[PDB]
Amino acid sequence: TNMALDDSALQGFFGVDRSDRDPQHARAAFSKRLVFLKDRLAKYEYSVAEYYTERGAWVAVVNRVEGMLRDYPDTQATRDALPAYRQMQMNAVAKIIAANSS
Amino acid sequence: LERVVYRPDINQGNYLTANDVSKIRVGMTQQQVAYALGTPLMSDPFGTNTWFYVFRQQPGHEGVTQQTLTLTFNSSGVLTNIDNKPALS
């Protein structure tokens, strides 16, 4: 498995993540080997959501979040991805937030 | 401080105009509406047969204006109801 594209000597030495780097190589890598990739990819999508949450493009975030909820139901991001959009009156959402609280 | 700092324009949501919204009728089908208005950007996360449209603009170093459109459909994809919020409250 070509996991060599998810590291480097410098990125490895200082103990930092590579999840916010181009993820396309990890998707190619996808082909319990898939648990790591599941979360490495979900973190990417989450980080993008955070960027736009701070920037304020929350509608695109909502669509990305629905993509995450549909395609990765079992990752940590499913909780992390829950929230900028809540400034708008939405027919909330609350049932899934409460049902899976932990 | 923030109120005098330069900001790029913010553009979010889909385009809306009276020329198209005034043409939408109850009984009009999702294919006809999608043609007239364009592909929806938002939908119900739980599969409710309803469409939402949002037109939000905030010029740089200015405030934000937003209009929304709500479309309620039956099980056949035929619009049953409609609402609209021309401005934020």
Partner: peptide
């Protein structure tokens, strides 16, 4: 090298008393 060894469980969220889902990236 050991990061994958976390082996976090892939538990799905349960529905409240139904979100849109797909079958891509399935676990065989």
């Amino acid at each position: 090298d050991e990061a994958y060894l976390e082996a976090a469980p892939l538990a799905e969220l349960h529905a409240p008393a139904l979100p849109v889902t797909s079958g891509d990236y399935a676990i065989p």
